Design an enzyme around this catalytic site. Structure first.
Site, PDB file in Angstrom:
ATOM      1  N   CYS A 107     -20.936   5.629  -1.305  1.00 57.26           N
ATOM      2  CA  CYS A 107     -22.361   5.363  -1.517  1.00 57.26           C
ATOM      3  C   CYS A 107     -22.988   5.618  -2.843  1.00 57.26           C
ATOM      4  O   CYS A 107     -22.895   6.672  -3.443  1.00 57.26           O
ATOM      5  CB  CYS A 107     -23.417   6.068  -0.574  1.00 57.26           C
ATOM      6  SG  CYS A 107     -25.353   5.682  -0.730  1.00 57.26           S
ATOM      7  N   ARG A 110     -26.629   7.755  -4.097  1.00 60.74           N
ATOM      8  CA  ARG A 110     -26.772   9.169  -3.560  1.00 60.74           C
ATOM      9  C   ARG A 110     -27.925   9.662  -4.614  1.00 60.74           C
ATOM     10  O   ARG A 110     -28.098  10.915  -4.275  1.00 60.74           O
ATOM     11  CB  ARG A 110     -25.556   9.701  -3.589  1.00 60.74           C
ATOM     12  CG  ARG A 110     -24.755   9.275  -2.212  1.00 60.74           C
ATOM     13  CD  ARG A 110     -23.524  10.139  -2.362  1.00 60.74           C
ATOM     14  NE  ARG A 110     -22.593   9.238  -2.982  1.00 60.74           N
ATOM     15  CZ  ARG A 110     -21.376   9.897  -3.387  1.00 60.74           C
ATOM     16  NH1 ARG A 110     -20.969  11.057  -3.164  1.00 60.74           N
ATOM     17  NH2 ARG A 110     -20.467   9.279  -4.203  1.00 60.74           N
ATOM     18  N   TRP A 279     -32.251   1.047   1.432  1.00 52.85           N
ATOM     19  CA  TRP A 279     -32.589  -0.166   0.757  1.00 52.85           C
ATOM     20  C   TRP A 279     -31.596  -0.691   0.390  1.00 52.85           C
ATOM     21  O   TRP A 279     -30.627   0.035  -0.136  1.00 52.85           O
ATOM     22  CB  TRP A 279     -34.019   0.163  -0.108  1.00 52.85           C
ATOM     23  CG  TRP A 279     -33.964   0.596  -0.965  1.00 52.85           C
ATOM     24  CD1 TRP A 279     -33.104   0.521  -2.533  1.00 52.85           C
ATOM     25  CD2 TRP A 279     -34.386   2.030  -1.478  1.00 52.85           C
ATOM     26  NE1 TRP A 279     -33.255   1.473  -3.186  1.00 52.85           N
ATOM     27  CE2 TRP A 279     -34.188   2.492  -2.551  1.00 52.85           C
ATOM     28  CE3 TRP A 279     -35.253   2.935  -0.494  1.00 52.85           C
ATOM     29  CZ2 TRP A 279     -34.249   3.883  -3.188  1.00 52.85           C
ATOM     30  CZ3 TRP A 279     -35.544   4.250  -0.810  1.00 52.85           C
ATOM     31  CH2 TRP A 279     -35.243   4.531  -2.161  1.00 52.85           C
ATOM     32  N   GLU A 284     -25.091  -6.590  -2.439  1.00 53.10           N
ATOM     33  CA  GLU A 284     -24.847  -6.595  -0.925  1.00 53.10           C
ATOM     34  C   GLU A 284     -25.110  -7.877  -0.238  1.00 53.10           C
ATOM     35  O   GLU A 284     -24.466  -8.379   0.508  1.00 53.10           O
ATOM     36  CB  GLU A 284     -25.516  -5.415  -0.186  1.00 53.10           C
ATOM     37  CG  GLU A 284     -25.172  -4.068  -0.651  1.00 53.10           C
ATOM     38  CD  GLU A 284     -25.748  -2.813  -0.120  1.00 53.10           C
ATOM     39  OE1 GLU A 284     -25.253  -2.488   0.994  1.00 53.10           O
ATOM     40  OE2 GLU A 284     -26.794  -2.285  -0.668  1.00 53.10           O
TER      41      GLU A 284
HETATM   42  C1  HEM Z   1     -31.893   4.445  -0.427  1.00 50.58           C
HETATM   43  C2  HEM Z   1     -30.975   3.413  -1.288  1.00 50.58           C
HETATM   44  C3  HEM Z   1     -29.482   3.232  -0.750  1.00 50.58           C
HETATM   45  C4  HEM Z   1     -28.692   2.302  -1.486  1.00 50.58           C
HETATM   46  C5  HEM Z   1     -29.186   1.431  -2.510  1.00 50.58           C
HETATM   47  C6  HEM Z   1     -27.102   2.342  -0.825  1.00 50.58           C
HETATM   48  C7  HEM Z   1     -26.380   1.844  -1.207  1.00 50.58           C
HETATM   49  C8  HEM Z   1     -25.013   1.589  -0.624  1.00 50.58           C
HETATM   50  C9  HEM Z   1     -24.056   0.644  -0.864  1.00 50.58           C
HETATM   51  C10 HEM Z   1     -24.155  -0.517  -2.049  1.00 50.58           C
HETATM   52  C11 HEM Z   1     -22.927   0.925  -0.377  1.00 50.58           C
HETATM   53  C12 HEM Z   1     -21.496   0.198  -0.262  1.00 50.58           C
HETATM   54  C13 HEM Z   1     -21.478  -0.627   1.114  1.00 50.58           C
HETATM   55  C14 HEM Z   1     -21.260  -1.909   0.806  1.00 50.58           C
HETATM   56  O1  HEM Z   1     -20.163  -2.274   0.148  1.00 50.58           O
HETATM   57  O2  HEM Z   1     -22.157  -2.837   1.157  1.00 50.58           O
HETATM   58  C15 HEM Z   1     -23.323   2.085   0.592  1.00 50.58           C
HETATM   59  C16 HEM Z   1     -22.572   2.664   1.547  1.00 50.58           C
HETATM   60  C17 HEM Z   1     -22.781   3.809   2.351  1.00 50.58           C
HETATM   61  N1  HEM Z   1     -24.082   4.478   2.246  1.00 50.58           N
HETATM   62 FE1  HEM Z   1     -25.480   4.242   0.814  1.00 50.58          FE
HETATM   63  N2  HEM Z   1     -27.229   3.503   0.203  1.00 50.58           N
HETATM   64  C18 HEM Z   1     -28.489   3.639   0.197  1.00 50.58           C
HETATM   65  C19 HEM Z   1     -29.078   4.699   1.139  1.00 50.58           C
HETATM   66  C20 HEM Z   1     -28.209   5.465   1.775  1.00 50.58           C
HETATM   67  C21 HEM Z   1     -28.680   6.564   2.994  1.00 50.58           C
HETATM   68  C22 HEM Z   1     -30.075   6.846   3.143  1.00 50.58           C
HETATM   69  C23 HEM Z   1     -27.563   6.813   3.590  1.00 50.58           C
HETATM   70  C24 HEM Z   1     -27.471   8.041   4.972  1.00 50.58           C
HETATM   71  C25 HEM Z   1     -28.290   8.862   5.084  1.00 50.58           C
HETATM   72  C26 HEM Z   1     -26.487   6.155   2.925  1.00 50.58           C
HETATM   73  C27 HEM Z   1     -25.014   6.523   3.499  1.00 50.58           C
HETATM   74  C28 HEM Z   1     -23.863   5.455   3.230  1.00 50.58           C
HETATM   75  C29 HEM Z   1     -22.730   5.674   3.591  1.00 50.58           C
HETATM   76  C30 HEM Z   1     -22.169   6.624   4.688  1.00 50.58           C
HETATM   77  C31 HEM Z   1     -22.012   4.645   3.201  1.00 50.58           C
HETATM   78  C32 HEM Z   1     -20.474   4.433   3.347  1.00 50.58           C
HETATM   79  C33 HEM Z   1     -20.321   3.284   4.580  1.00 50.58           C
HETATM   80  C34 HEM Z   1     -18.927   3.236   4.751  1.00 50.58           C
HETATM   81  O3  HEM Z   1     -18.140   3.811   4.638  1.00 50.58           O
HETATM   82  O4  HEM Z   1     -18.658   2.227   5.954  1.00 50.58           O
HETATM   83  N3  HEM Z   1     -26.752   5.390   2.240  1.00 50.58           N
HETATM   84  N4  HEM Z   1     -24.646   2.479   0.286  1.00 50.58           N
HETATM   85  C1  LIG Z   2     -27.183   3.164   4.175  1.00 49.79           C
HETATM   86  C2  LIG Z   2     -26.945   2.004   3.510  1.00 49.79           C
HETATM   87  C3  LIG Z   2     -27.820   1.257   2.593  1.00 49.79           C
HETATM   88  C4  LIG Z   2     -27.351   0.107   1.955  1.00 49.79           C
HETATM   89  N1  LIG Z   2     -27.986  -0.459   0.833  1.00 49.79           N
HETATM   90  N2  LIG Z   2     -26.255  -0.372   2.032  1.00 49.79           N
HETATM   91  C5  LIG Z   2     -25.604   0.240   2.933  1.00 49.79           C
HETATM   92  C6  LIG Z   2     -24.034  -0.414   3.348  1.00 49.79           C
HETATM   93  C7  LIG Z   2     -23.195  -0.014   4.299  1.00 49.79           C
HETATM   94  C8  LIG Z   2     -21.972  -0.535   4.587  1.00 49.79           C
HETATM   95  C9  LIG Z   2     -20.809   0.103   5.159  1.00 49.79           C
HETATM   96  C10 LIG Z   2     -19.736  -0.667   5.439  1.00 49.79           C
HETATM   97  C11 LIG Z   2     -19.594  -2.192   4.875  1.00 49.79           C
HETATM   98  C12 LIG Z   2     -20.680  -2.793   4.247  1.00 49.79           C
HETATM   99  C13 LIG Z   2     -21.747  -2.083   4.145  1.00 49.79           C
HETATM  100  C14 LIG Z   2     -20.357  -4.205   3.954  1.00 49.79           C
HETATM  101  N3  LIG Z   2     -19.488  -4.603   3.668  1.00 49.79           N
HETATM  102  C15 LIG Z   2     -19.519  -6.008   2.746  1.00 49.79           C
HETATM  103  C16 LIG Z   2     -18.499  -5.353   4.478  1.00 49.79           C
HETATM  104  C17 LIG Z   2     -18.637  -4.149   5.873  1.00 49.79           C
HETATM  105  O1  LIG Z   2     -18.428  -2.787   5.034  1.00 49.79           O
HETATM  106  C18 LIG Z   2     -23.564   1.229   4.902  1.00 49.79           C
HETATM  107  C19 LIG Z   2     -24.884   1.554   4.618  1.00 49.79           C
HETATM  108  C20 LIG Z   2     -25.685   1.278   3.804  1.00 49.79           C
HETATM  109 CL   LIG Z   3     -25.360  -5.523   4.896  1.00 46.73          CL
END
Ligand code: HEM
Ligand SMILES: Cc1cc(N)nc2cc(-c3ccc4c(c3)CN(C)CCO4)ccc12
Ligand SMILES: [Cl-]
Ligand code: HEM
Ligand SMILES: Cc1cc(N)nc2cc(-c3ccc4c(c3)CN(C)CCO4)ccc12
Ligand SMILES: C[C@H](O)[C@H](O)[C@H]1CNc2nc(N)[nH]c(=O)c2N1
Ligand SMILES: C[C@H](O)[C@H](O)[C@H]1CNc2nc(N)[nH]c(=O)c2N1
Ligand SMILES: [Ca+2]
Ligand SMILES: [Ca+2]
Ligand SMILES: [Ca+2]
Ligand SMILES: [Cl-]
Ligand SMILES: [Gd]
Ligand SMILES: [Zn+2]
Lengths: 403, 403
Positions: A107, A110, A279, A284
């Protein structure tokens, strides 16, 4: 090795990650080969995780070694001895959910980790009550476009009783309707969940942006189908600030990224239903969701409309078109007053998070391949930052599908 | 674990890397934490490495376990017995240099690995003779713009005797002059080597693209200063196909990427002086060398000339400026008839290489962070390809600076 040296190659600065040596679970790499790029890598063991978590909690409030600290450890030990499990205090649930975000290596958002609204749904008893909790979450988090990070945590796993599960991977997803040819109308990432919804009684649409219903599973029951009220699901039609034909593509995306299929682990306890939301970062939507060849795949159509030379790679038509699609996303969300962050601002804030975490804990678990954005990688500071990836608990974890 | 499963997320295809299991050495990762993003991770011992290489060689020519194979093994044994080291046959050297390239996990250009000109300079005696070998290399490899991959191998390291070394990190490098206002005029990456050239008698220039002299080191006698004949250093002035003011920025880059500071290891033998060259991928010049903030850092200069909105990140001015800089590189090299490859073409060829190597060896060591280009990451097929990173020999390795 025990304390790896970490270098930033833009600035030359050097740190040592002392936190990784405390990593509590094991990953997929070995000295013989690195698997960092792969997407998918009781009482005394429960008590060990519980005690460590209570220690983290009392440390976070600067009361380590207090009477209250000692008494809570003994209270947890007594509950596990009598029941084989234990119950979190309300304060521990809130702290544990924030820690799990803080600990998420993939993430980039964070910097926000301490600002998380935690809805306690551990007294939920039915799928209908689950749906009410989820709707209140969506309404709170969306906040008419001024998004607020939130998590709702449903009852923990326990012996002799099935799990709560949300079958959908996100609370808001567009249908993917598989065609006879093998083509897809809508989002190809969602073909399987779409077919499961139809199988469980949903009348499908035939659009490219049909919001799916929820399949909610209460303990030991088949999933139950719930439609989201359209006034609850905020969407942004996509337009471009200077390419007026872009609006005629009829593209849209939704405001709220809310992941619902991960397991939250706190202190050895497991919460298989604990959807969380923040958000969007614009890449993404603009780069992955719209331009991945296996997603909406709009790149060639946009390039052709822009009159780019799509016949040769070296014209960089893909690059030019991807940029304007990302511009369209940022413009459209800003116009609609829906929270969005660009990949430059987000990666800048993540660098500040790394600095904060180095001072607070001596490191930060971070997955370089996921932190670096999918366009303009080396133009962002995180590209030039070495990172150490490891698993800390509390954590969000992948879990198998409930079907 | 033994045979990692490797998935392509764009196509859904699956392979198993059975080659990783044969990883001779050990990298920096452990089950506790992944260090994949870090840039820098007895006659009986020599015989063991020499033995395995000779087997690789005779297997590669379909002469396994034959008479010539059995004879070569016993010849190395006898040579080690009498000398403490051994000599490669020229054909084994050719095989090993190609395998070292094939085995390089960070190189996206390895589709070309079977086409490599090996210049045997192992009879070299002096720094003067070193300069002649290097000039012949540059002339052959440049080929008036029709670039050809090559490597020149100087004598191997041996006991009781200094190494040959090329002090410069590349055969062609622009000077980096520390200014009084703290800034750097020229390439900041080359400040240390520029000062060493001046230390060893070089009369510096005052331009932003001044080609550095070579510091060449024969065994035990000290480094000698050598000027490259200007007619041998092919450069490409950068212009843009439609932005007429771009040429006025005075940017240029050189034709030949020739790395000279890595060590080549074959069969336990080590060659600290073995410069090798290919041709450029355009992102190396247009994105990294020109737009890295710690390199030429021209991004804002270009964006000001494009009248972009540089006071908000969400205008994506950095992205738009980077795209046009990369266009300028491709256009200028193509106009000058100097070999260049764009990042889309190059990553597509690497996918074919992965397919080739899966059939030939059951896998391919690949470093995802270095394979994925620094712009338009997910627009390229390698972004969606899981990769396994591991160290095979023969190999190119990093080594300490000779000073
Ligand atoms: C507040 C604005 C936030 C932004 C801009 C953000 C952004 C992102 C992005 C860009 C990713 C990469 C996922 C992808 O490749 O599409 C991600 C993954 C992730 N986010 Fe954040 N996030 C936010 C909030 C949160 C919150 C509130 C949580 C949990 C309470 C969280 C937990 C996670 C986790 C666990 C992943 C990994 C997902 C996975 O491994 O499949 N995020 N986040
Ligand atoms: C909380 C939160 C906020 C945020 N802004 N983005 C998030 C994105 C993921 C995410 C997790 C796995 C994943 C993908 C996105 C997308 N990819 C492109 C393909 C599938 O793998 C999880 C949580 C998010
Ligand atoms: Cl998405
Ligand atoms: C023929 C065209 C070639 C292309 C397009 C190419 C491309 C690249 C690229 C883009 C990188 C990433 C490093 C960076 O960011 O600049 C790289 C690294 C590397 N290349 Fe290739 N290359 C080519 C030829 C060769 C040859 C002929 C050799 C050796 C015989 C070679 C050996 C290596 C090695 C060892 C690395 C690792 C660099 C390091 O770890 O510091 N390459 N190459
Ligand atoms: C043979 C060949 C051909 C080619 N086209 N490019 C090459 C690039 C390197 C390379 C080596 C080190 C390195 C970097 C690139 C990258 N950046 C600039 C950080 C500094 O570290 C080595 C050999 C190449
Ligand atoms: C193969 C590769 O690991 C996979 O495509 C990863 C790469 N990096 C990523 N990074 C982010 N943020 N999100 C992703 O889905 C991926 N996918
Ligand atoms: C920290 C990070 O691993 C390091 O800066 C890498 C990232 N990927 C790279 N990729 C290439 N091709 N060249 C590089 O120098 C780097 N630098
Ligand atoms: Ca109780
Ligand atoms: Ca010869
Ligand atoms: Ca202006
Ligand atoms: Cl370079
Ligand atoms: Gd317009
Ligand atoms: Zn690793």
């Amino acid at each position: 090795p025990k304390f790896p040296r970490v270098k930033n190659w833009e600035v030359g600065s050097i740190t040592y990650d002392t936190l990784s040596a405390q990593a509590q679970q094991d990953g997929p790499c070995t000295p013989r080969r690195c698997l960092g790029s792969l997407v998918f890598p009781a009482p005394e063991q429960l008590l060990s995780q519980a005690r460590d978590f209570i220690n983290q909690y009392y440390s976070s409030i600067k009361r380590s070694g207090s009477q209250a600290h000692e008494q809570r450890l003994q209270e947890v030990e007594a509950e596990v001895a009598a029941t084989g499990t234990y119950q979190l205090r309300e304060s521990e649930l809130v702290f544990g959910a924030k820690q799990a975000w803080r600990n998420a290596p993939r993430c980039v958002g964070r910097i926000q980790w301490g600002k998380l609204q935690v809805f306690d749904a551990r007294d939920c008893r039915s799928a209908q009550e689950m749906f009410t909790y989820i709707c209140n979450h969506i309404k709170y988090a969306t906040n008419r476009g001024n998004l607020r990070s939130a998590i709702t945590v449903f009852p923990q796993r326990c012996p002799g009783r099935g799990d709560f599960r949300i079958w959908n991977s996100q609370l808001v997803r567009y249908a993917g309707y598989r065609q006879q040819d093998g083509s897809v109308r809508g989002d190809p990432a969602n073909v399987e969940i779409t077919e499961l919804c139809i199988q469980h009684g949903w009348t499908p649409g035939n659009g490219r942006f049909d919001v799916l219903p929820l399949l909610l599973q209460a303990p030991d029951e088949p999933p139950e189908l719930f439609l989201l009220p359209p006034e609850l699901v905020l969407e942004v039609p996509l337009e471009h600030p200077t390419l007026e034909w872009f609006a005629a593509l009829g593209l849209r995306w939704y405001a709220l990224p809310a992941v619902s299929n991960m397991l939250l682990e706190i202190g050895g306890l497991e919460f298989p239903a604990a959807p969380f939301s923040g958000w969007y970062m614009s890449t993404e939507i603009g780069t992955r969701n719209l331009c991945d060849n296996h997603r909406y795949n709009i790149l060639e159509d946009v390039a052709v409309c822009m009159d780019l030379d799509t016949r040769t790679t070296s014209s960089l038509w893909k690059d030019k078109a991807a940029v304007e699609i990302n511009v369209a996303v940022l413009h459209s969300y800003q116009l609609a007053k829906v929270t969005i962050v660009d990949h430059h601002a987000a990666t800048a804030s993540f660098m500040k998070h790394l600095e904060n975490e180095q001072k607070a804990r001596g490191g930060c678990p971070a997955d370089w391949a996921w932190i670096v954005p999918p366009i303009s990688g080396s133009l962002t500071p995180v590209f030039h930052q070495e990172m150490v990836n490891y698993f800390l608990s509390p954590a969000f974890r992948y879990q198998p599908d409930p079907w």
